[PDB]
């Protein structure tokens, strides 16, 4: 009835896909082989799997994601590893030459040899779907197979499925630390093309994951697996109301209808509540009021932008577990009186509160058995600081002809950089007239 399609493009998308799909498998009863166990059962009976998991005759369940990556070996580990039987063999779309951390090699030269197959499988997965609820695109704003292939996929999905909601789970490159040198080029050149083909872009930053793991999870040395699992909990809790039942169920059309005020301003921030780490989790009272304070604390924010330097627009709170609604009514009443969280003057009510009656599941490993969670998804003005910190890098690299030939000689043209910067100027502009106070 309510089925969602996830398209995992780029290596970061594929690894976050492995994390979110192992989370789905251990959240339902769906085994790594594919048969729900005979002498076991879980919870939600015979309809709750009809989300992201698909049903086939005699019980062999299949996912409905599309893992696409223009290189092998990172698809090969996902397929060869502990989830060899679950995935359908053709849903794993492999390239043959690596996309080379290049927008041109993702978008204008190796863009045709596989997008016909990717769109063909998207059509076949849409055939076995009574209600196509939405598309969630898991990708990075970095390398070529995560930027160019995602960007090329966006206009074809906008052409074929223009009436469907499509949203982004994004790996923004960190304003401080970074791992590649043409991250500003690639990020701007993909968000130019996905600005008109993205209805909402949930954003995750690796440095923010790092110091949350340092501070709360008490890991002084985390890895990409630990990062993608914490991203996966965000993804599963956002997509929870179609899976299960509660008091306030949040639809994926309710996400767009409550979170994006203007059609261009669709860049919110995710954050999670308790990210406590077991050996210090049972010592805490773990209240709805204190997790509602902790998500608005300016240290659990999942991108490195300071929320005090701006105004919030729309906050979507998704609670899971034993959440009495009047606890969150008192929590919002406590939020609306603190001066550290400033609101715009044109959104008097901005809190989309949804409650789901199921506690978080725990992957064997890091996170703690907690009978509560909330994901906080806020549109703020503070993403303009990230846009400024990356556009400064773009201007400083563009001033003296760095790395332009790899783009222009392989399918790109010289102009697209300039009008992508013009679009960044337009977005950074619009984020100021939306944030300015009314004087009329």
């Amino acid at each position: 009835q309510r089925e969602c399609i996830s398209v995992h493009v780029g290596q970061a998308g594929v690894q976050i896909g492995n994390a979110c799909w192992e989370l789905y498998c251990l959240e339902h009863g769906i085994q790594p082989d594919g048969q729900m166990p005979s002498d076991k059962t879980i919870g939600g009976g015979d309809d709750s799997f009809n989300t992201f998991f698909s049903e086939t005759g005699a019980g062999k369940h299949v996912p409905r994601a599309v893992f696409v990556d223009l290189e092998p070996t990172v698809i090969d580990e996902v397929r060869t590893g502990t989830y060899r039987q679950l995935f359908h063999p053709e849903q794993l779309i492999t390239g043959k030459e690596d996309a080379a951390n290049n927008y041109a090699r993702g978008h204008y030269t190796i863009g045709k040899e596989l997008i016909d197959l990717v769109l063909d499988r998207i059509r076949k997965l849409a055939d076995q779907c009574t209600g196509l609820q939405g598309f969630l695109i898991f990708h990075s704003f970095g390398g070529g197979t995560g930027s160019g292939f995602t960007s090329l996929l966006m206009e074809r999905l906008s052409v074929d499925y223009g009436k469907k909601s499509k949203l982004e789970f994004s790996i923004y490159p960190a304003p401080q630390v970074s791992t590649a040198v043409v991250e500003p080029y690639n990020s701007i050149l993909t968000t130019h093309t996905t600005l008109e083909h993205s209805d909402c872009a949930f954003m995750v930053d690796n440095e923010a994951i790092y110091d949350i793991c340092r501070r709360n999870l008490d890991i002084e040395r985390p890895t990409y697996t630990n990062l993608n699992r914490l991203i996966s909990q965000i993804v599963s809790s956002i997509t929870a109301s179609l899976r299960f039942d509660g008091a306030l169920n949040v639809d994926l059309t309710e996400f767009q209808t409550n979170l994006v005020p203007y059609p261009r301003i669709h860049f919110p921030l995710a954050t999670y509540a308790p990210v406590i780490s077991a050996e210090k989790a049972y010592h805490e009272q773990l209240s709805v009021a204190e997790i509602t304070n902790a998500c608005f604390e300016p240290a659990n924010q999942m991108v490195k932008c300071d929320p005090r330097h701006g105004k919030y627009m729309a906050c979507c709170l998704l609670y899971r577990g034993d959440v009495v609604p009047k606890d969150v009514n008192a929590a919002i009443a406590a939020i609306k009186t603190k001066r550290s969280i400033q609101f715009v003057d044109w959104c008097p009510t901005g809190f989309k509160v949804g409650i789901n009656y199921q506690p978080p599941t725990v992957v064997p490993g890091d996170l703690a058995k907690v009978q509560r969670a909330v994901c906080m998804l806020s549109n703020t003005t503070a993403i303009a600081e990230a846009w400024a910190r990356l556009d400064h890098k773009f201007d400083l690299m563009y001033a003296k002809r760095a790395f332009v030939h790899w783009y222009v000689g392989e399918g790109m043209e010289e102009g697209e950089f300039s009008e992508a910067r013009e679009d960044m100027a337009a977005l950074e502009k619009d984020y100021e007239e939306v944030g300015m106070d009314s004087v009329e």
């Binding site: 092998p72 698809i75 090969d76 397929r79 060869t80 063999p89 053709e90 794993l92 492999t94 043959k96």
Partner: protein, 87 residues
């Protein structure tokens, strides 16, 4: 490559597309990756690191071919005559 769980267990098929090498496989030609990858890995293990004489007599009337000795065999019928191919 040999992660077919080894032995003769079912597991032995590398999922379609597995760009991985199957030492001693491309040097074979005939069926589908699944059953190939299987036999492909088995190949490694190996060293790792007329027909009418019997009950099937008759040779089939008009059989296109020379049953040794037919030239000079005057007797009963192609059947009886060819009841012993390699006699």
């Amino acid at each position: 490559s040999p992660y077919s769980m080894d032995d003769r267990d079912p597991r032995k098929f590398f999922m379609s597309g597995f760009t991985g090498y199957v030492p001693r496989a491309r040097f074979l030609f005939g069926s589908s990756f699944p059953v190939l990858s299987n036999q492909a890995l088995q190949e490694f293990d190996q060293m790792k690191s007329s027909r009418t004489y019997p009950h099937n007599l008759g040779l089939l009337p008009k059989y296109g071919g020379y049953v040794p000795g037919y030239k000079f065999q005057f007797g009963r019928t192609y059947g009886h005559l060819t009841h012993d191919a390699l006699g």
